[PDB]
Design a protein around this ligand. Structure first.
Ligand SMILES: COc1cc2c(cc1OC)[C@@H]1CC(=O)[C@@H](CC(C)C)CN1CC2
Length: 389
């Protein structure tokens, strides 16, 4: 039982965090051109930036400690610091709550995302199994961002009060209970002692090319989402029906990307899904400067969400293959590098990177984050055969 059931646990533990981070979307409206939103965004920019820096600064401290504690207690902090955040939103009268309420969730996201991916890395040892399995587990992000806003928005308008958080606190304790049974995560058990120290993974070039590819893929969508024309007009008229829908294309395309390139990327060679993984991000972003209508953003969202899925699902199992080929196999830490790289685009990119566009115009910030991705694609020639220890 245990091998296969931990995929269902880590899928659900990624789904609920990725649904919870996204159900705040139709709530945000309570607080001349499609990219001028860079200037209106700054309040919303801080809601994307806060979760991702508090999650990012935590990744070394969860990833390192996972080796000392054992995996199960970090996954339980992943359920729990995210659950107490779910309950916190249920009486958020002001932005303050939202901002801090997010901060607690960031820690839960780390606790869940690093230790859960390390649990799949530890448990699924063969590359074909680990590719199919991590592609399906990363399908938790892709299903969470899709499922969450349509459900959250319909409850927020039709049922009212703060209902979309109480019904999610119902589903989060169901996952927490299923962890208490399936993992038996109430015991103190350490991992193989004094394994690879993170500075030595960070000084090996071959892990950086994979982590960098996971980061630079996310950076293209991280500048885009905070500054969509989705926040101001929606209060006034029946166009509010678009408030939850705008992520649906990027989050169907991620699902098919992480699900298909969970199986196919192993077979063709995963390096070609960083090369054709960031060529597609870059060219999909490069259609944004020719949009002048929100419908014109549906096409570039779909190729970004697909290509994010093709990179993540191909490069997350490369983290495991590299510690299995150049280092010592304790995955408490390498997934700390992979997850800060995933996360950092949302931490840094919206606000610190948003300062680029205001002096220049925003179609230049989008076109350049596009080229930085087509230029990264040939750098993965180092991942054809990482030379053995
Ligand atoms: C309201 O806040 C947030 C909203 C959203 C995200 C993150 C947020 O906060 C940090 C995720 C993060 C991801 O994983 C990407 C999934 C895509 C490729 C389908 C992009 N966006 C989708 C919406």
């Amino acid at each position: 039982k245990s091998r296969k059931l931990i995929l269902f646990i880590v899928f659900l533990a990624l789904l609920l965090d990725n649904m919870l981070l996204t159900v705040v979307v139709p709530i945000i409206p309570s607080y001349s051109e499609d990219k001028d939103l860079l200037n209106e965004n700054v309040q919303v920019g801080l809601l994307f930036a806060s979760k991702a820096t508090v999650q990012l600064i935590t990744n070394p401290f969860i990833g390192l400690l996972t080796n000392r504690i054992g995996y199960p207690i970090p996954i339980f902090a992943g359920f729990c610091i995210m659950f107490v955040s779910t309950i916190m939103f249920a009486f958020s009268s002001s932005y303050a709550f939202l901002l801090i309420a997010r901060s607690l969730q960031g820690i839960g996201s780390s606790c869940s995302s690093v230790a859960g991916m390390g649990m799949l890395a530890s448990v699924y040892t063969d590359d074909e199994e680990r590719g199919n399995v991590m592609g399906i587990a990363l399908g938790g992000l892709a299903m969470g961002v899709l499922v969450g806003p349509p459900f959250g928005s319909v409850l927020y308008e039709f049922v009212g009060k703060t209902a979309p958080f109480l019904v999610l606190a119902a589903l989060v304790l169901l996952d927490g209970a299923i962890q208490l049974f399936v993992l038996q995560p109430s015991r103190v058990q350490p991992e193989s002692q004094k394994g690879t120290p993170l500075t030595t993974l960070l000084k090996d070039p071959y892990i950086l090319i994979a982590a960098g590819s996971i980061c630079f893929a996310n950076m293209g969508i991280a500048m885009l989402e905070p500054a969509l024309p989705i926040w101001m007009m929606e209060t006034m008229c029946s166009r509010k029906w678009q408030l939850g829908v705008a992520f649906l294309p990027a989050s169907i395309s991620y699902l098919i990307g992480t699900n298909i390139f969970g199986i196919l990327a192993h077979k063709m060679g995963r390096w070609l899904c960083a090369l054709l993984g960031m060529i597609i991000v870059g060219v999909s972003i490069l259609c944004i400067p020719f949009a002048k209508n929100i419908y014109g953003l549906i096409a570039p969202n779909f190729g970004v969400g697909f290509a994010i899925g093709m990179v993540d699902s191909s490069m997350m199992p490369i983290m495991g293959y590299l510690v299995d080929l150049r280092h010592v196999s304790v995955y408490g830490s390498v997934y700390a590098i992979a997850d800060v790289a995933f996360c950092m685009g949302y931490a840094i990119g919206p606000s610190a990177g948003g300062a680029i566009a205001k002096a220049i115009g925003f179609p230049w910030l989008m076109t350049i984050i596009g080229i930085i991705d087509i230029l990264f694609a040939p750098l993965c020639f180092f991942l054809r055969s990482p030379p053995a220890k």
